[PDB]
JSON list of C-alpha atoms in Angstrom, two decimals:
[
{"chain": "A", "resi": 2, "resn": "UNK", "atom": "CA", "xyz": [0.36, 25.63, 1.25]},
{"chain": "A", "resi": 3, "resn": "UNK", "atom": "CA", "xyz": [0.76, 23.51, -1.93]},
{"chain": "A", "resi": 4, "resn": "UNK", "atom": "CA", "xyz": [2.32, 20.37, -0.03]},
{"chain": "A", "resi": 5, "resn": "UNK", "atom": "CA", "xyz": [-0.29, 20.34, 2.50]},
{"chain": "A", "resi": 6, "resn": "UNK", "atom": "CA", "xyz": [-2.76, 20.73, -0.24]},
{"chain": "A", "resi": 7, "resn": "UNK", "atom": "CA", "xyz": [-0.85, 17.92, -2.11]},
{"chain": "A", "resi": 8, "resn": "UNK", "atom": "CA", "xyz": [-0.83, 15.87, 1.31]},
{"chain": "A", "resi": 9, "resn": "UNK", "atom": "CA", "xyz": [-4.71, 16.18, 1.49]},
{"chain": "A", "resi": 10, "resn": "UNK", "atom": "CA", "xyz": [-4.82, 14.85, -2.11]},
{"chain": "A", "resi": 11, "resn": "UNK", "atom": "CA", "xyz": [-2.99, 11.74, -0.85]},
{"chain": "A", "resi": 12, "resn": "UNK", "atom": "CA", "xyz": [-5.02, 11.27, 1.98]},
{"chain": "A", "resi": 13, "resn": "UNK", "atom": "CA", "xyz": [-8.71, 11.43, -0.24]},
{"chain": "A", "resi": 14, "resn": "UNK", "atom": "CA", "xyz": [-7.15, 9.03, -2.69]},
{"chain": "A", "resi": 15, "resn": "UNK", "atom": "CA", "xyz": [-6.12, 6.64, 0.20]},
{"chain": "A", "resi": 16, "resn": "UNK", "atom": "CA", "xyz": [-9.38, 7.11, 1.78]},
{"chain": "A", "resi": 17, "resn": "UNK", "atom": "CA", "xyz": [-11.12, 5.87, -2.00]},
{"chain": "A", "resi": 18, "resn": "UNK", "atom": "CA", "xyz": [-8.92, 2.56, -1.57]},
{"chain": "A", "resi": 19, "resn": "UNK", "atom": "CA", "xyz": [-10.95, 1.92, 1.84]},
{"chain": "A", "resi": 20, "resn": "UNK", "atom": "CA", "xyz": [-14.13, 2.39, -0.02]},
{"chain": "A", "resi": 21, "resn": "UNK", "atom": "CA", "xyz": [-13.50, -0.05, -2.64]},
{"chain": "A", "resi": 22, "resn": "UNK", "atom": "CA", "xyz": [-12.08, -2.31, -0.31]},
{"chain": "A", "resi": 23, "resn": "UNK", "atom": "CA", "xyz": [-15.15, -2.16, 1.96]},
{"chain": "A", "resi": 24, "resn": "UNK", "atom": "CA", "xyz": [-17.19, -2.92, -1.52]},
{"chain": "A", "resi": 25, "resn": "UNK", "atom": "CA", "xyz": [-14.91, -5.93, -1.33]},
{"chain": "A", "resi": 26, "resn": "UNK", "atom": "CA", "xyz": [-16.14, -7.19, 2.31]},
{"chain": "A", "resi": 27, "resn": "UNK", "atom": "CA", "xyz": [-19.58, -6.86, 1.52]},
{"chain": "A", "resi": 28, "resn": "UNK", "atom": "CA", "xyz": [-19.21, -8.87, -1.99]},
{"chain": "A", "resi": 29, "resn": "UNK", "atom": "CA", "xyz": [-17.60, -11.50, -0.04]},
{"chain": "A", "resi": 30, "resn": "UNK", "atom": "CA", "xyz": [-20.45, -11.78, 2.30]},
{"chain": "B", "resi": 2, "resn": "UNK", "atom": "CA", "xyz": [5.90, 23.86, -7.86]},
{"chain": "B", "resi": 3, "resn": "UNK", "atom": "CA", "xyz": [7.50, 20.59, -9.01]},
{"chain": "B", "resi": 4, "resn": "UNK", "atom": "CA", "xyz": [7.33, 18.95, -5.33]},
{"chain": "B", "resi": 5, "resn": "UNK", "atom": "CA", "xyz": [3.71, 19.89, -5.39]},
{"chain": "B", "resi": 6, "resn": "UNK", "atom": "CA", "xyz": [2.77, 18.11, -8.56]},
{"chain": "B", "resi": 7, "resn": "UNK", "atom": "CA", "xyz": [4.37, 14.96, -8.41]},
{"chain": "B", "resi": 8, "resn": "UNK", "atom": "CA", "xyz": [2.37, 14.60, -5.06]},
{"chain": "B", "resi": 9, "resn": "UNK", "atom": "CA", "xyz": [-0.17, 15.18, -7.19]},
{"chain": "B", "resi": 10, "resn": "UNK", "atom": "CA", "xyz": [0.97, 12.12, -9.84]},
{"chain": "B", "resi": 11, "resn": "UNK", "atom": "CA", "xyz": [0.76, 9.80, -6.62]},
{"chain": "B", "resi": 12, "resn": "UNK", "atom": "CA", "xyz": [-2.59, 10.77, -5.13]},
{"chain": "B", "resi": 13, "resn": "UNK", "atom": "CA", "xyz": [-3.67, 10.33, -9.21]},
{"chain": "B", "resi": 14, "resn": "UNK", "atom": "CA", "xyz": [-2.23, 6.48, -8.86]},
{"chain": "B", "resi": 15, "resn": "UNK", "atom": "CA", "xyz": [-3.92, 5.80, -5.94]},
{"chain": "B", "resi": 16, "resn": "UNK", "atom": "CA", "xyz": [-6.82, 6.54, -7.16]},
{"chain": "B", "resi": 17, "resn": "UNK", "atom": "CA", "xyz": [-6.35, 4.29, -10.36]},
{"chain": "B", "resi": 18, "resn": "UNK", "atom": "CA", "xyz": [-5.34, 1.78, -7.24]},
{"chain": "B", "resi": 19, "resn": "UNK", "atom": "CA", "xyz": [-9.02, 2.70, -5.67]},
{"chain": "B", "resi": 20, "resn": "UNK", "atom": "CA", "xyz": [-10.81, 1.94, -9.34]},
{"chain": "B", "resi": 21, "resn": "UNK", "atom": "CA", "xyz": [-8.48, -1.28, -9.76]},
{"chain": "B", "resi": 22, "resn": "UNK", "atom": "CA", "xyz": [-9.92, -2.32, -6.71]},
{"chain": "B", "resi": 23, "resn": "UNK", "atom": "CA", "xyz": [-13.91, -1.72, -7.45]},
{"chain": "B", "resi": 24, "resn": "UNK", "atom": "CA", "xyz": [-13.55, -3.69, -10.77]},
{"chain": "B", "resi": 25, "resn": "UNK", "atom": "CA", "xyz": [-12.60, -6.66, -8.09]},
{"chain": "B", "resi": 26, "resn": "UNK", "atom": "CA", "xyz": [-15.86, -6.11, -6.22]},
{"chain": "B", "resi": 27, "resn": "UNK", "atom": "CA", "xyz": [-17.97, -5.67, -9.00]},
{"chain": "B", "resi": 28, "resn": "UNK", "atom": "CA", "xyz": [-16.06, -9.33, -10.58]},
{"chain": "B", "resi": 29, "resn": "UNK", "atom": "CA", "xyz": [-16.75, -10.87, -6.86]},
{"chain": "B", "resi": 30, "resn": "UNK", "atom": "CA", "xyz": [-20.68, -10.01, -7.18]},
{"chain": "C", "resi": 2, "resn": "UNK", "atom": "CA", "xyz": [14.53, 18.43, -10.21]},
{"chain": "C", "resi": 3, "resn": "UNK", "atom": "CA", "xyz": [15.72, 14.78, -8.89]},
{"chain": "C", "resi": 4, "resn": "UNK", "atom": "CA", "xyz": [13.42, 14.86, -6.17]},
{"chain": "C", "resi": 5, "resn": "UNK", "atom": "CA", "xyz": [10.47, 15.46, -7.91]},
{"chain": "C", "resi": 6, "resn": "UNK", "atom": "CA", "xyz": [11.70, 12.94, -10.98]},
{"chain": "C", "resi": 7, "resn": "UNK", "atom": "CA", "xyz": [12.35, 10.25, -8.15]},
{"chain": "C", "resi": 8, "resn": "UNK", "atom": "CA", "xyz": [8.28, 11.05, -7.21]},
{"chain": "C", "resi": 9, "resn": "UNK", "atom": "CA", "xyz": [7.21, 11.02, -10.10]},
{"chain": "C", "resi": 10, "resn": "UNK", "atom": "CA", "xyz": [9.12, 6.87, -10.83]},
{"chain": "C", "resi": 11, "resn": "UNK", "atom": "CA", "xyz": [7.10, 6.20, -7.59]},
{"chain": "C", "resi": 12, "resn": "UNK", "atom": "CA", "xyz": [3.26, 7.52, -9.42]},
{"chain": "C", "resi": 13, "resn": "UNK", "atom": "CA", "xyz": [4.33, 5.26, -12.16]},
{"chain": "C", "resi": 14, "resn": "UNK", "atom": "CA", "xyz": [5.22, 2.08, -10.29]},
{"chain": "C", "resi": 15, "resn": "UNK", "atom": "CA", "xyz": [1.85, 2.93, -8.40]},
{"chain": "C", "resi": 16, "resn": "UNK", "atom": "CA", "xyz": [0.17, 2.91, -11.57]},
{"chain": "C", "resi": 17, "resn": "UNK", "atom": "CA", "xyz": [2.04, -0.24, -12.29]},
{"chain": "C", "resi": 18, "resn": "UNK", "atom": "CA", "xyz": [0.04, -1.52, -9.36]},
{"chain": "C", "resi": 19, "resn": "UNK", "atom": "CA", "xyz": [-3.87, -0.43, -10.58]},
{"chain": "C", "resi": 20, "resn": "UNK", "atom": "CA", "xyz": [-3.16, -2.02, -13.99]},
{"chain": "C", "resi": 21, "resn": "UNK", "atom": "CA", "xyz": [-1.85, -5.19, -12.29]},
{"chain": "C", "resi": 22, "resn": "UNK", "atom": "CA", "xyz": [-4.90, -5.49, -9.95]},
{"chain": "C", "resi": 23, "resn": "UNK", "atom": "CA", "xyz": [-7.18, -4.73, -13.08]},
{"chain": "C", "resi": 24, "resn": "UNK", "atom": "CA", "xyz": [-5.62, -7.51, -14.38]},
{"chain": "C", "resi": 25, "resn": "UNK", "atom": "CA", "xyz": [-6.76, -9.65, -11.64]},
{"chain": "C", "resi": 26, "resn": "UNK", "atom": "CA", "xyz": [-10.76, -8.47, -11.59]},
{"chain": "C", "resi": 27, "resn": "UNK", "atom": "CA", "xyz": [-10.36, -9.61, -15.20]},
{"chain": "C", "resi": 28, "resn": "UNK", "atom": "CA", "xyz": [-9.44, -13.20, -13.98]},
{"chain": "C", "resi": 29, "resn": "UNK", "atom": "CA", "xyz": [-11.95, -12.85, -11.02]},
{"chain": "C", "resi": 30, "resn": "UNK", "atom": "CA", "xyz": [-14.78, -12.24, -13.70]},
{"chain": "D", "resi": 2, "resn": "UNK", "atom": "CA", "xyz": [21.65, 12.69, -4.71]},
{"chain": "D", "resi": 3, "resn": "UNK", "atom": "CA", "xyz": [21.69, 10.17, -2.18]},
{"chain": "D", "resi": 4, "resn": "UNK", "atom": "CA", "xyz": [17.72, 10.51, -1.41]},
{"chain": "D", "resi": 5, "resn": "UNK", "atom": "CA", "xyz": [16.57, 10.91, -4.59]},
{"chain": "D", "resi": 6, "resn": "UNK", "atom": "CA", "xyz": [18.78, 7.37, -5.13]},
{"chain": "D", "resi": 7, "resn": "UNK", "atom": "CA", "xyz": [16.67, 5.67, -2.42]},
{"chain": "D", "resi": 8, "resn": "UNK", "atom": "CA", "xyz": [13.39, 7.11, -3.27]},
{"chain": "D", "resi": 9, "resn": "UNK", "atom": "CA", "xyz": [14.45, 5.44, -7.20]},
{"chain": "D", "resi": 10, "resn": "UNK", "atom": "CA", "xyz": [14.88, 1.86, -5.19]},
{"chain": "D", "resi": 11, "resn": "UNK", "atom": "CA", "xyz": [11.39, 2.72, -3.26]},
{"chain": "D", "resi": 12, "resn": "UNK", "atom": "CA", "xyz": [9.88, 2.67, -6.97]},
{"chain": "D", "resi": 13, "resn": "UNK", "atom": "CA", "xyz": [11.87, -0.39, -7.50]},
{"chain": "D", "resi": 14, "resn": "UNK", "atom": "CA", "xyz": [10.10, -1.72, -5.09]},
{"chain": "D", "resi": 15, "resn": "UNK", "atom": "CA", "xyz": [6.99, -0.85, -5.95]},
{"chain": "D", "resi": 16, "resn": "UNK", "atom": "CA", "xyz": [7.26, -2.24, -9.29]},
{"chain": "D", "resi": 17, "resn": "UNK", "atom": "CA", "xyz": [8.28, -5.96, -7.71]},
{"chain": "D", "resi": 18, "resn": "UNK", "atom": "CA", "xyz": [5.26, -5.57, -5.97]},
{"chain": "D", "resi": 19, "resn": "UNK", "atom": "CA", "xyz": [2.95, -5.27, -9.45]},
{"chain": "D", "resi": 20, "resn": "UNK", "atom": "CA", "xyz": [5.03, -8.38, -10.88]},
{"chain": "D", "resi": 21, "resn": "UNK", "atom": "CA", "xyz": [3.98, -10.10, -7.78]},
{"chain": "D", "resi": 22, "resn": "UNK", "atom": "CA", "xyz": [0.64, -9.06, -8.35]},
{"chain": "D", "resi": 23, "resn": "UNK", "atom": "CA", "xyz": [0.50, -10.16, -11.97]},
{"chain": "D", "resi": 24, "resn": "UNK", "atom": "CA", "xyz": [1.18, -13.16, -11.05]},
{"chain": "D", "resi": 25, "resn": "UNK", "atom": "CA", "xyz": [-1.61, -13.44, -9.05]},
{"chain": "D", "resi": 26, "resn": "UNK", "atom": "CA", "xyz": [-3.93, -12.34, -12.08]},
{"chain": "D", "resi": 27, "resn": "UNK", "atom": "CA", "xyz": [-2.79, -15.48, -14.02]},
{"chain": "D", "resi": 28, "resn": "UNK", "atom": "CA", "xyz": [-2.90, -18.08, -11.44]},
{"chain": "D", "resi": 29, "resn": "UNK", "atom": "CA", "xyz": [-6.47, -16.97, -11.29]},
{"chain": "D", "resi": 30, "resn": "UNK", "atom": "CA", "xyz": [-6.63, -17.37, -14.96]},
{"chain": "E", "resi": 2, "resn": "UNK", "atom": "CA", "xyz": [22.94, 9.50, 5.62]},
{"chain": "E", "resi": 3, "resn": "UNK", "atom": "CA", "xyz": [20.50, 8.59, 7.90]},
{"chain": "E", "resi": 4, "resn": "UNK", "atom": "CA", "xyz": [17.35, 9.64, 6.15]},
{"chain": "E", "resi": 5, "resn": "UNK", "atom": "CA", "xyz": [18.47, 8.09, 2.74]},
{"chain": "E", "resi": 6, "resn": "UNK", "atom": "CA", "xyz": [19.34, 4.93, 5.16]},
{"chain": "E", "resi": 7, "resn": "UNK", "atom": "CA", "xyz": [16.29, 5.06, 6.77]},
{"chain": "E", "resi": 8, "resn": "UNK", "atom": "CA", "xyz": [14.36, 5.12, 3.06]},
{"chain": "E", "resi": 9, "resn": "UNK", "atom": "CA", "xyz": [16.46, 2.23, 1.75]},
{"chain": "E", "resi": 10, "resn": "UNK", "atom": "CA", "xyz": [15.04, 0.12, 4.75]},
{"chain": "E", "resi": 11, "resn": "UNK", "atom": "CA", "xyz": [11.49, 1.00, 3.80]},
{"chain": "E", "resi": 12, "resn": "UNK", "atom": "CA", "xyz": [12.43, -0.20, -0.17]},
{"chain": "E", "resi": 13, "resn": "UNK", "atom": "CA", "xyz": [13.67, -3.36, 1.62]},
{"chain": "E", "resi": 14, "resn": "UNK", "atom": "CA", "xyz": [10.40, -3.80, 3.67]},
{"chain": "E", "resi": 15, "resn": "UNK", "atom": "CA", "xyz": [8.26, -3.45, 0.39]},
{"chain": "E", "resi": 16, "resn": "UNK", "atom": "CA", "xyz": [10.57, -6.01, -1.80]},
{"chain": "E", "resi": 17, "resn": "UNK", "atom": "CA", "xyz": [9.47, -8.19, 1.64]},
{"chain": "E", "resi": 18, "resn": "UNK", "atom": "CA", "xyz": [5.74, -7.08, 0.68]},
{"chain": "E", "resi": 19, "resn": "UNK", "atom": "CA", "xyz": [6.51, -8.19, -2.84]},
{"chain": "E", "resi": 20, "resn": "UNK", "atom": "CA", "xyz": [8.22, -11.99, -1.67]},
{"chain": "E", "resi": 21, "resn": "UNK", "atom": "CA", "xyz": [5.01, -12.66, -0.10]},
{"chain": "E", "resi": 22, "resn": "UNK", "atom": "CA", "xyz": [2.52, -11.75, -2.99]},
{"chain": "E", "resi": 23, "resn": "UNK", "atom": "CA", "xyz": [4.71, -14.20, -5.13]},
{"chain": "E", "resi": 24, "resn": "UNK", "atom": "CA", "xyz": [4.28, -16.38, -2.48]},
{"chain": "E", "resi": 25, "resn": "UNK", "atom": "CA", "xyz": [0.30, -16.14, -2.81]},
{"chain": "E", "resi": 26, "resn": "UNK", "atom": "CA", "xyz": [0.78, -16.29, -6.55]},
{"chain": "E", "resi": 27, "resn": "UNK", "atom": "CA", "xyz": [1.94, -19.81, -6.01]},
{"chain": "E", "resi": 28, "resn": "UNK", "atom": "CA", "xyz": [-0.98, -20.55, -3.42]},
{"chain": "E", "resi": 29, "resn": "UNK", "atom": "CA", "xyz": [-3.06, -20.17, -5.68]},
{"chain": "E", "resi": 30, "resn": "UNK", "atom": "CA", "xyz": [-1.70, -21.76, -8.67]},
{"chain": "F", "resi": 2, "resn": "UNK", "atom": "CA", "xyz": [17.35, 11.76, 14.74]},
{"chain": "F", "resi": 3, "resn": "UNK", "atom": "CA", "xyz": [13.23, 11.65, 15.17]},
{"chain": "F", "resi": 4, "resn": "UNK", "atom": "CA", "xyz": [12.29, 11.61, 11.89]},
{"chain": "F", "resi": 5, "resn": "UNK", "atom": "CA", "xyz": [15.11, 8.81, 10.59]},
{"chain": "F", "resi": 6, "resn": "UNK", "atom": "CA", "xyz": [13.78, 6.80, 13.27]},
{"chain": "F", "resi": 7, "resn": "UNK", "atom": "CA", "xyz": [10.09, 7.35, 12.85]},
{"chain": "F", "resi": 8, "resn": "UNK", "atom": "CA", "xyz": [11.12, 6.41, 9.11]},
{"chain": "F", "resi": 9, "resn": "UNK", "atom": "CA", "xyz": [12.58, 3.48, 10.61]},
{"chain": "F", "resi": 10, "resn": "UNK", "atom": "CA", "xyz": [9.15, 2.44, 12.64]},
{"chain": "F", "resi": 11, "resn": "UNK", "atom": "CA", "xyz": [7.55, 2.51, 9.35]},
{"chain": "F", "resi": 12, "resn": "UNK", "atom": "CA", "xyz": [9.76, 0.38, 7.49]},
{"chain": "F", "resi": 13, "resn": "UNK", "atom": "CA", "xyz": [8.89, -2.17, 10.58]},
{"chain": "F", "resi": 14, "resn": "UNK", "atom": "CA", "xyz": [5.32, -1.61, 10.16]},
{"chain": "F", "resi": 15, "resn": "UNK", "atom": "CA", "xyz": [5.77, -2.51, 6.55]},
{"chain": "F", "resi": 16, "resn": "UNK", "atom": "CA", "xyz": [7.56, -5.74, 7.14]},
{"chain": "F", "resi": 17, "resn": "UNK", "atom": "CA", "xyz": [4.54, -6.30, 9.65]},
{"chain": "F", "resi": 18, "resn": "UNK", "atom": "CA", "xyz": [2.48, -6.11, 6.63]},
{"chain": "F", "resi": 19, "resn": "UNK", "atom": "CA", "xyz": [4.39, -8.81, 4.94]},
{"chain": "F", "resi": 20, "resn": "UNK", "atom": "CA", "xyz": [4.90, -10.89, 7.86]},
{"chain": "F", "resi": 21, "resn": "UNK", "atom": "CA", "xyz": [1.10, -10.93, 7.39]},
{"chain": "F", "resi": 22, "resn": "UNK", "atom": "CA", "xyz": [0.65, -11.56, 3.89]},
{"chain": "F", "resi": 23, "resn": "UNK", "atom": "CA", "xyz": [2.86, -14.77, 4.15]},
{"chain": "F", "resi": 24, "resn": "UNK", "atom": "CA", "xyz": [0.53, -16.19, 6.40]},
{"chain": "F", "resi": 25, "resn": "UNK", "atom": "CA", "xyz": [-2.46, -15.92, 3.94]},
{"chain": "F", "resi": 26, "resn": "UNK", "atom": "CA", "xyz": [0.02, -17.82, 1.43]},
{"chain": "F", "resi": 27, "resn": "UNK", "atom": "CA", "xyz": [0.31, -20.20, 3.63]},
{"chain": "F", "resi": 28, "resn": "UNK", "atom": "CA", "xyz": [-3.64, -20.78, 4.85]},
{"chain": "F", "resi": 29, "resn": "UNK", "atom": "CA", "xyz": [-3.67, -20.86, 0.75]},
{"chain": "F", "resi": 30, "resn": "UNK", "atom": "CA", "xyz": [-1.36, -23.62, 0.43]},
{"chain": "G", "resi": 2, "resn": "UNK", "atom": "CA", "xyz": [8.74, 17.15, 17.28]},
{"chain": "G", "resi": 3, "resn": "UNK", "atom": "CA", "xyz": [5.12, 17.55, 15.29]},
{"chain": "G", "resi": 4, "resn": "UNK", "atom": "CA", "xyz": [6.41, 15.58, 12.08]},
{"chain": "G", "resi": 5, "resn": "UNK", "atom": "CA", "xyz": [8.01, 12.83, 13.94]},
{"chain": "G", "resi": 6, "resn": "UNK", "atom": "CA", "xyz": [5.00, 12.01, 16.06]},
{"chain": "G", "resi": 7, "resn": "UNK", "atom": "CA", "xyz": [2.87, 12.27, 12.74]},
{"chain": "G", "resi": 8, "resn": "UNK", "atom": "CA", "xyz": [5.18, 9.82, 10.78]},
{"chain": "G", "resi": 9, "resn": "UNK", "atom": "CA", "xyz": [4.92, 7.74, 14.47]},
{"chain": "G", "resi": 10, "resn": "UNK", "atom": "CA", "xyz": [1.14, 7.64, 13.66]},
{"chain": "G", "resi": 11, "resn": "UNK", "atom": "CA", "xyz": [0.89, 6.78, 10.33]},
{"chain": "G", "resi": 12, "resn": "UNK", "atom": "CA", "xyz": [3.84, 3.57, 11.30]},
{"chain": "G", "resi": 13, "resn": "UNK", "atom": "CA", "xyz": [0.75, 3.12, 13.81]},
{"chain": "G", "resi": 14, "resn": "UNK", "atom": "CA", "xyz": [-1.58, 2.83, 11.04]},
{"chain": "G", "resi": 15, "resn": "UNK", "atom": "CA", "xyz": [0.64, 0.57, 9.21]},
{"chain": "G", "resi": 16, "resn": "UNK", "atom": "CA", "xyz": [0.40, -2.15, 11.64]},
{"chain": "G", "resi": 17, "resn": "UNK", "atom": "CA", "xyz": [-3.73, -1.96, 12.41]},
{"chain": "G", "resi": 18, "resn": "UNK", "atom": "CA", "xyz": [-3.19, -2.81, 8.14]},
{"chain": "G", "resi": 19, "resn": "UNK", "atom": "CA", "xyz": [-0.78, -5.96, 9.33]},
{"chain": "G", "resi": 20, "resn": "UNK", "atom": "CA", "xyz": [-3.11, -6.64, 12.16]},
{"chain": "G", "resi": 21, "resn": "UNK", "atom": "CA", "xyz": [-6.40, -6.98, 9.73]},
{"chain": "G", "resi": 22, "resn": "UNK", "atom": "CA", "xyz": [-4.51, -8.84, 7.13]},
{"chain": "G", "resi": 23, "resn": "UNK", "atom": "CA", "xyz": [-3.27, -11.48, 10.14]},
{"chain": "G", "resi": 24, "resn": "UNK", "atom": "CA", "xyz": [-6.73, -12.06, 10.37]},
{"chain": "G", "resi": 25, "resn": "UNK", "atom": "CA", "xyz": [-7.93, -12.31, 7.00]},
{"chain": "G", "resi": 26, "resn": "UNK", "atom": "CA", "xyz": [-5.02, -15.54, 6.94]},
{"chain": "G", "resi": 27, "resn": "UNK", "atom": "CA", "xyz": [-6.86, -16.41, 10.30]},
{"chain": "G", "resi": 28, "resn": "UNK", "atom": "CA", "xyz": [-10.35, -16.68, 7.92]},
{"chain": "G", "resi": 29, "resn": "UNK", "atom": "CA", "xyz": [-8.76, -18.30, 5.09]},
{"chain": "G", "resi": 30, "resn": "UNK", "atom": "CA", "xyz": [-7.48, -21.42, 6.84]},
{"chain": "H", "resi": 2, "resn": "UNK", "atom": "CA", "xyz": [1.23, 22.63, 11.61]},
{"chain": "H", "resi": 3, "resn": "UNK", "atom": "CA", "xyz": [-0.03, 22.24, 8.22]},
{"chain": "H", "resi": 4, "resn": "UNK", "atom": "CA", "xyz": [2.20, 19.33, 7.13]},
{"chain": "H", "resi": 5, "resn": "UNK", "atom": "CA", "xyz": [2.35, 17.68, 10.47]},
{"chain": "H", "resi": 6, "resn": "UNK", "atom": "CA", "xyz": [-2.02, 17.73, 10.25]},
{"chain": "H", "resi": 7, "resn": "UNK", "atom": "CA", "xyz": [-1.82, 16.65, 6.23]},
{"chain": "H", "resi": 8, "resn": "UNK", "atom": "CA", "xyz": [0.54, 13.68, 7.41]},
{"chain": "H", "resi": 9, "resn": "UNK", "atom": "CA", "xyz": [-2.65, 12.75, 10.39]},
{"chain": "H", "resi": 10, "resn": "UNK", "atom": "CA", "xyz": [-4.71, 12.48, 8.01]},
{"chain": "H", "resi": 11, "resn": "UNK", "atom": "CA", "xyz": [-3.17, 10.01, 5.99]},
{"chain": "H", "resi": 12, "resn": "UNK", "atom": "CA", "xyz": [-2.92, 8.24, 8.99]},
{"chain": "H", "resi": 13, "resn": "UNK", "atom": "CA", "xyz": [-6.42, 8.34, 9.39]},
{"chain": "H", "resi": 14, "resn": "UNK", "atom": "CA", "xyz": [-7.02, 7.17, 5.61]},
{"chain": "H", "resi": 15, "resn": "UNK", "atom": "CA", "xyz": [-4.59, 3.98, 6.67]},
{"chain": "H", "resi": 16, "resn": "UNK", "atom": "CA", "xyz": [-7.11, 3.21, 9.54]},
{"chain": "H", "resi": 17, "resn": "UNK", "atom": "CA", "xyz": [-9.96, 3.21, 7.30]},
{"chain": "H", "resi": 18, "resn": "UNK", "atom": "CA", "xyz": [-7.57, 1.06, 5.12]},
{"chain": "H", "resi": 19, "resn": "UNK", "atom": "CA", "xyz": [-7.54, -1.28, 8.16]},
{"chain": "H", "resi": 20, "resn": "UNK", "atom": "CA", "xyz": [-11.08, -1.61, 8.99]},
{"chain": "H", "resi": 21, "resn": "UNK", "atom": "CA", "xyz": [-12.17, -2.69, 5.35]},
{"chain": "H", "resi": 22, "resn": "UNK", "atom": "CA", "xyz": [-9.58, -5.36, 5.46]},
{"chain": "H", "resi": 23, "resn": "UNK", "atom": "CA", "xyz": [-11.05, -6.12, 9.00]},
{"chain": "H", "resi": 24, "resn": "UNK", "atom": "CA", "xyz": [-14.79, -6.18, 7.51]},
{"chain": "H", "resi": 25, "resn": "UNK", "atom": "CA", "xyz": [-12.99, -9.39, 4.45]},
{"chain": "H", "resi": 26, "resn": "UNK", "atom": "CA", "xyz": [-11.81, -11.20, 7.16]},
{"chain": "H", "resi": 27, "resn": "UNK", "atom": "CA", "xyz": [-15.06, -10.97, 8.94]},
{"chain": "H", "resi": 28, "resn": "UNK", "atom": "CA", "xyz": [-16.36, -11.48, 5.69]},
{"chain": "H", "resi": 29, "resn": "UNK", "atom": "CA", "xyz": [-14.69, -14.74, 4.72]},
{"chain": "H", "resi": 30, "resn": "UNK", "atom": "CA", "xyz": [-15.30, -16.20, 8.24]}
]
C-alpha cells in the first residue's frame, strides 16, 4: 500500500541521517 | 493519495537533514 | 485535506532544520 | 480538526528547534 | 481527545529539545 | 487506549532526548 | 495490538538516541 | 501488517541513529 510504501521512504531517509552521522564519528577521530 | 505524498514531503526533508549533515563531516575533515 | 496540509507544515519545518544545520557546516568550515 | 491542530503545534515545534539551531551556526561564527 | 492530547505532549517534548539547543547555542558562544 | 499511550512513551523518550542534550550544554559551559 | 507495540519500539529507539547523546556530554566534559 | 512492519523499520533506522551518535562520543573520548 501507498502508506507503507510512504513509511519505507521515511525509514531510508532516516537511515541516510545515520550515515552522515557515522561520517561525523570518524571525522572526529 | 494526499496522505501518501506528504509522507513523501517528510522522507524528502530528511534527506535534506542527511545532506545538511555530510556538509558537517566534510567541514570537520 | 487538513491532515495532509498539517504534514506537509511538518516537511517544511524539517526543511527548516537541513538549511539551519547547513548553516552550521558553513561556520564549521 | 483537533489533530490536524496538534500536528500544526508539532511543526511549531520543529521550527523552534531550527532557531535553536541557527543559533548554534553563529556562535560558531 | 486523547490522541490529539497525546500529540500536543510530543510538541511539548520537542519545544524541550529546542530549550536545550539554545542552551548549547550559549555554550558555545 | 494503546496507541495514545504508546504516543505518550514517545513524547517521554523525546524529553529523554533533551534531558540529554542539556547535559552537553552544560559539559560546554 | 501490532501498531501499539510498533510505536512502543520506535519510543524504544528514542531513548538508545538519549542514551548515546548522555554519553557524547560524558566525552565532552 | 504492512504499517505495523513500515513503523519497525523506522525503529530500526532510529537504532542506527543511535549507534553513530555512540561511535562521536567514542569519537571525542
Amino acid at each position: 500500500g501507498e502508506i507503507a510504501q510512504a513509511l519505507k521512504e521515511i525509514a531510508k531517509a532516516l537511515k541516510e541521517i545515520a550515515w552522515a552521522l557515522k561520517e561525523s564519528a570518524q571525522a572526529l577521530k
